[PDB]
């Protein structure tokens, strides 16, 4: 299928302590595989899934020096942004970044990403063309002109089309009997009496990966978006996920209702009713 890599970076300033905390998490196919954190005793990119221990000390030392560079980059940028937004001292501030690449099933670059947010808010992003920048804020225009005049987009384009792709290829080959799995959901339906003449039927899906899933209810034919309650997909804590969707229903006439579970690990959508 298709594949991806992302680095998610964060720097947080606080009123007191004299330097921002910086954290970077790498993901391959939306699963964590590296991590650097400046608060750690040994600030260094540590590995995060079994398959990454294949890398020699030369890989970790280079990546760690890279993170130290980013930390200092985030540090100066935080300073500059404070001035750009005429923010005084004595506050908390956040600078975040997402970057990476999406491959197709043919292992070629589909899309590159480079995005920044300040205070949790879109600040500047490299457009899909990997040549021009989107920056909504008036304050962000200063950064955008600076980066337009410096050929920054060329530098990021080369990483995204080159290193990002080349090294993701490499990471997939090393953990092939690892990230080439999906756990299908196990669904069941439970029954919950309420205000009589009526009853809540609750469709459960358990033990699935990845997290994307859809649960529908049907009154013998047409789907029910009202008032179908659901929860947001949640981690079970063991790598798998959980979800439920419920619909309230006349007591006795409940065998009319059907629940469907759509997941990318199923050979086909599952179909389910209440079983007394």
């Amino acid at each position: 299928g298709p594949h991806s890599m992302r680095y998610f970076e964060t720097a947080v300033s606080r009123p007191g302590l004299e330097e921002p905390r910086y954290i970077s998490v790498g993901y391959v196919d939306n699963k964590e595989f590296v991590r650097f954190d400046s608060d750690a005793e040994n600030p260094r990119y540590e590995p995060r899934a079994p398959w990454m221990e294949q890398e020699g000390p030369e890989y970790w030392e280079r990546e760690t020096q890279k993170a130290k560079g980013q930390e200092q980059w985030f540090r100066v940028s935080l300073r500059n942004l404070l001035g750009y937004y005429n923010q005084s001292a004595g506050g908390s501030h956040t600078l975040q970044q997402m970057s990476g690449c999406d491959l197709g099933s043919d292992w070629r670059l589909l899309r590159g990403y480079l995005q920044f947010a300040y205070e949790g808010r879109d600040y500047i992003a490299l457009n899909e063309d990997l040549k021009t920048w989107t920056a909504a804020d008036m304050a962000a225009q200063i950064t955008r002109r600076k980066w337009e005049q410096s050929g920054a987009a060329e530098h990021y384009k080369a990483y995204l089309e080159g290193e990002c792709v080349e090294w993701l290829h490499r990471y997939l080959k090393n953990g092939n009997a690892t990230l080439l799995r999906t756990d299908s959901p196990k669904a069941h339906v439970t029954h919950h009496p309420r205000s009589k003449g009526e009853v809540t039927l609750r469709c459960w899906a358990l033990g699935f990966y990845p997290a994307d899933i859809t649960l529908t209810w049907q009154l013998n034919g047409e789907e029910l978006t009202q008032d179908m309650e659901l929860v947001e997909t949640r981690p079970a804590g063991d790598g798998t996920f959980q979800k439920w969707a419920s619909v309230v229903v006349p007591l006795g006439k409940e065998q009319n209702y059907t629940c469907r579970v759509y997941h990318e690990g199923l050979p086909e959508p599952l179909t389910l009713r209440w079983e007394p």
């Binding site: 680095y7 980013q70 940028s77 970044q97 950064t143 980066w147 290193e163």
Partner: peptide, 9 residues
Amino acid sequence: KAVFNFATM
């Protein structure tokens, strides 16, 4: 492989 950034903001 991590990106390294170009000009600061």
